């Protein structure tokens, strides 16, 4: 009450922005802030003198430069790249016939957070995460698994080590914060899509050599190893080429799981196809079976995107209805897309 109208004069009139640096163990905090100006603050209010911690920012008086208050300021590229939020509307009921694959990871997506008891009733402690892979280009069908995992906890998806390869290290460090800001958001989940590290070779901008890119992946696991980190952030990882990864990534984690993605079979293509054309009204002669029955070795993306070609001409005529006379004939274009392209 009166304290608010008392210390406002000590605060007053303005107060600067400092950078919290180091402490005399007597709690006289030596700071380097522009330009390299120090101070000694043992002040009684608002602290929490400990946790403000080295390597932070402070707010200093003019006379004389005592930090009377502190903030946590981001923004920054740190928090921005993790979020927000999202939970897109797709579900794990979208992909059928592969339930054998997701019912495996079902307990892996379920047991952390939801339904935790029989983890600790067994007490065997399986919090080892997951690894993913499959042909040819997959992992958005696993995003169709990941879009379902958005029903629980919180999630971030990252792509590649690219943020390290943009320049000479720089270490892992942008991965480090992304790893330890998931501790700030713990419990959470983090996934890196299709690790290209040594799978792809050349770099954008400037990078080298192999070992610094080798070790930034080696440190990626060794930080996640870790010494000694309980933090989850249940780690989801995927690459569609099992070759290039260093095989030692499996044993520390995830040890138990790397999902095998089977290519779609005849009835799986039938199970998958109608989910798309459910919304797009087919004409009388349009049939799901015969087309995909004759066609072989398709992809869920194509069998989803084969409906888009009819979404051109029928929409060029501005028609709500698909026509198989086109959908047959137009399929040649997507057939030409796979054949010649």
């Amino acid at each position: 009450e009166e304290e608010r109208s008392k210390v406002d004069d000590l605060r007053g009139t303005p107060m600067s922005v400092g950078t919290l640096e180091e402490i005399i163990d007597d709690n006289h905090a030596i700071v380097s802030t522009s330009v390299g100006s120090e101070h000694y603050v043992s002040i009684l209010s608002f602290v929490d003198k400990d946790l403000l911690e080295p390597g932070c920012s402070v707010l200093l008086n003019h006379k004389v430069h005592a930090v009377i208050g502190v903030l946590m300021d981001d923004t920054d590229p740190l928090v921005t790249v993790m979020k927000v939020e999202k939970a897109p509307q797709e579900t794990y009921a979208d992909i059928g016939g592969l339930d054998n694959q997701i019912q495996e990871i079902k307990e892996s997506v379920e047991l952390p957070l939801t339904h935790p008891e029989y983890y600790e009733e067994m007490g065997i402690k399986p919090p080892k995460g997951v690894i993913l892979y499959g042909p040819p280009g997959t992992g958005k069908t696993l995003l169709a698994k990941a879009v379902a995992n958005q029903t629980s906890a919180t999630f971030l998806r990252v792509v590649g080590s690219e943020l390290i390869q943009k320049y000479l290290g720089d270490g892992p460090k942008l991965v480090r914060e992304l790893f330890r800001v998931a501790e700030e958001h713990a419990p959470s989940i983090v996934f890196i899509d299709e690790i290209d590290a040594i799978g792809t070779k050349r770099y954008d901008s400037n990078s080298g050599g192999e070992r610094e890119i080798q070790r930034t992946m080696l440190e990626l696991l060794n930080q996640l190893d870790g010494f000694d980190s309980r933090g989850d952030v249940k780690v989801i990882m995927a690459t569609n080429r099992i070759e290039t990864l260093d095989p030692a990534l499996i044993r520390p984690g995830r040890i138990d799981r790397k999902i095998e993605f089977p290519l779609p079979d005849e009835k799986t293509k039938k199970r998958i196809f109608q989910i798309h054309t459910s919304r797009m009204t087919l004409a009388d002669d349009v049939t799901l079976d015969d087309l995909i029955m004759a066609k072989d070795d398709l992809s869920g993306a194509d069998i989803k995107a084969i409906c888009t070609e009819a979404g051109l001409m029928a929409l060029r005529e501005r028609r709500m209805k698909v026509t198989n006379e086109d959908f047959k004939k137009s399929k040649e274009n997507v057939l030409y897309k796979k054949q010649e392209g």
Binding site: P116, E117, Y118, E120, E121
Partner: protein, 694 residues
């Protein structure tokens, strides 16, 4: 005309028929068909704006719906004199229905944006001013029936047009999911009141005329109904055979068969544990030791002799659960004991509740369906004999719990004769007294009771009792949504808000997180103590995620009052389902050095969340609970509260015999618990004892 078939796209072809109307009527659609049929022509769907009026005035139907698919806009306002409007509307109404279901037997339409949006777009002008009885009743589609209704009091909407059972199945089905979001549900026949013979007649005719497949919803209904009013009104509505249906009714053979059914899936240990406690003679709690034999035995008489002979010592309140078990034993089936149950009342000037008020409460609470009708007038006359010695405070707390429970619409009013003693003026004791006293009398519902009692009691005003009085007005109307309109006051007492959101909102989905969260964040300090108390109602949906999460941070608070009310807010609403996170949380809770009953009330009540009336045979072993109560009683050393908790866990542990469930799955609420869960929130000395009856 020839202008609609023009290659030019220049606007517009709409409303041009209003300028020249009667003259184009000499032509026909023969000139219109080549424009719309032939493709690669300009203004294909644009001519439908002029054509929809021509096909509308000619009374032809099913053609207007096809031409209005592209428009979606001008269908609202279309050419005005209401006479041709309501004429062509009623002729199109009766004319569209015949164009559907002509196959016959569906296929159903085929909520599509064609029919449903069109019938609703015109239904706005239909429900605005003129006529009545639109196509919603004629078509039979239940989707348009949702949009048929307008905001109105739904007490008169309980009646509907009768039809076949085949369509009545889907009718009531979609009407149920329509009324779950609405305050009134098809299950309101329980609460309402009403009380007219209509709900009992239709309720007994829902299984008509089949007497075989009707075993469900009838036999299971009469044996699961604790009140006799249902088995009374439905008995007069039960037409099967003649006069001999009373065997399964009256809850005699009902409670007799389901008791043996509980013995089958049971049962609770009798000789082992209770004789071991008999070697320990009487515990120093004098509190929970009486309610043990209440639920346990049931029915055995010999232990009842030890019950009464002991409690003849009159010491403190221990007679509570004993004399309660005096009636509860024989009343487990029927009738029973109602002769010698009220005898100790007048036999034992009380001068307080713990002496002569125990057995006086017995006949009221143990009744459970009586009335009958002697118990009503007997209790009314017995309480009219003793007045000044009760008096207005301690025993008047429990007394209404024996009336409004059995019958909410009972004609006999005991409130007035029991409110003539309100002159005592004591502000402190009257809080917990007048609270449920006036709350447990009756459900009311006529809106006249609150006005009467407010005018005659206040007079003036009590400056205190009026707080809980408006809470009674809020509790009167059940989830009528008027409570958020009654919270605009927001007095500094703040007791209005907690009970207003708790009781005033009852629905399947929570939906109260915004208001429950707003009152705690915007509320004044010390109010957060009583905020979690709303968890006994709206948390019955999914308590696993919300409850332990929230209350985890408040369970570590150093304040004993908020700690008492935290584990309390979890309480019964979280004891239905078990989990390992609870069992793993029990650690470090009993290892605290904090004194006062709050510590052993935090831990021991948390032990009761493992199961309710389950075991031990079948299923969970009792040796684990015996080891826990044996190792936890070695501290302090007494601290007789450890002798309070070792009987406390076996209250609900060793009683069994009652599945709840919630109470209840049929969605009544226990009228004892809440009332009793209210008073100890400030428990100083004896008030937590009146809550032991549980």
């Amino acid at each position: 005309m020839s202008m609609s078939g023009e290659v030019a796209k220049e606007w517009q072809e709409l409303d041009d028929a209003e300028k020249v109307q009667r003259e184009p009527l000499l032509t026909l659609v023969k000139e219109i068909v080549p424009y719309n049929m032939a493709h690669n022509a300009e203004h294909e769907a644009c001519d439908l704006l002029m054509e929809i009026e021509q096909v509308d005035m000619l009374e032809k139907d099913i053609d207007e719906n096809a031409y209005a698919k592209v428009c979606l806009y001008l269908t609202s306002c279309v050419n005005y004199v209401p006479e041709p409007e309501n004429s062509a509307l009623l002729r199109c109404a009766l004319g569209v229905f015949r164009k559907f279901s002509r196959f016959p037997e569906a296929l159903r339409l085929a909520l599509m944006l064609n029919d449903m949006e069109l019938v609703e777009d015109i239904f706005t002008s239909c429900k605005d001013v003129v006529v009545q009885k639109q196509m919603a009743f004629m078509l039979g589609r239940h989707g348009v029936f949702l949009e048929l209704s307008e905001d109105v009091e739904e007490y008169e909407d309980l009646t509907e047009i009768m039809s076949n059972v085949q369509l009545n199945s889907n009718f009531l089905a979609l009407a149920r999911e329509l009324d779950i979001m609405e305050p009134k549900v098809p299950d309101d026949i329980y609460k309402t009141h009403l009380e007219n013979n209509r709900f009992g007649g239709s309720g007994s005719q829902v299984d008509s005329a089949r007497m075989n497949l009707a075993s469900s919803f009838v036999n299971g209904f009469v044996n699961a109904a604790f009140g006799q009013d249902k088995l009374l009104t439905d008995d007069g509505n039960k037409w099967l055979y003649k006069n001999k249906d009373h065997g399964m009714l009256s809850a005699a053979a009902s409670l007799g068969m389901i008791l043996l059914w509980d013995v089958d899936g049971g049962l609770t240990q009798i000789d082992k544990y209770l004789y071991s406690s008999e070697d320990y003679i009487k515990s120093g709690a004098l509190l929970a030791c009486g309610i043990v034999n209440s639920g346990v035995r049931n029915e055995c008489d010999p232990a009842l002799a030890l019950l009464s002979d002991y409690v003849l010592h009159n010491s403190n309140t221990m007679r509570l659960g004993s004399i309660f078990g005096l009636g509860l034993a024989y009343a487990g089936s029927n009738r029973e004991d109602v002769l010698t149950l009220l005898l100790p009342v007048m036999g034992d000037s009380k001068s307080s509740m713990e002496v002569a008020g125990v057995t006086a409460l017995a006949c009221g609470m143990i009744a459970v369906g009586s009335c009958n009708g002697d118990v009503t007038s007997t209790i009314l006359q017995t309480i009219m004999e003793k007045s000044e010695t009760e008096l207005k405070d301690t025993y008047a707390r429990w007394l209404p719990l024996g009336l409004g429970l059995n019958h909410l619409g009972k004609g006999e009013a005991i409130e007035a004769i029991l409110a003539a003693l309100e002159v005592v003026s004591e502000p402190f004791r009257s809080f917990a007294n007048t609270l449920v006293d006036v709350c447990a009398y009756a459900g009311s519902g006529n809106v006249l009771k609150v006005q009467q009692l407010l005018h005659i009691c206040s007079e003036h005003f009590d400056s205190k009792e009026k707080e809980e009085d408006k809470d009674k007005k809020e509790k009167k109307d059940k989830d009528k949504k008027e409570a958020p309109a009654d919270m605009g006051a927001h007095q500094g007492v703040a007791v209005l808000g907690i009970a207003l959101i708790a009781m005033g909102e009852e629905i399947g989905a929570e939906m109260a997180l915004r208001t429950f969260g707003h009152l705690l964040r915007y509320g004044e300090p010390t109010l957060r103590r009583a905020v979690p108390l709303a968890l006994a109602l709206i948390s019955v949906s999914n308590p696993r995620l919300n409850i332990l999460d929230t209350l985890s941070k408040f369970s570590h608070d150093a304040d004993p009052e908020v700690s008492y009310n935290s584990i309390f807010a979890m309480g019964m609403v979280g004891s239905g389902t078990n989990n390992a996170r609870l069992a793993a949380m029990l650690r470090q809770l009993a290892q605290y050095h904090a004194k006062d009953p709050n510590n052993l009330f935090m831990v021991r009540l948390a032990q009761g969340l493992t199961h309710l009336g389950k075991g031990t045979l079948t299923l969970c072993p009792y040796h684990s609970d015996r080891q826990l109560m044996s190792q936890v009683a070695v501290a302090g050393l007494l601290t007789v509260l450890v002798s309070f908790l070792d009987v406390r866990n076996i209250i609900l542990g060793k009683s069994h015999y009652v599945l709840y469930g919630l109470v209840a799955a049929m969605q009544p609420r226990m009228l004892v618990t809440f009332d009793e869960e209210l008073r100890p929130l400030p428990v100083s000395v004896r008030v937590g004892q009146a809550v032991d009856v549980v």
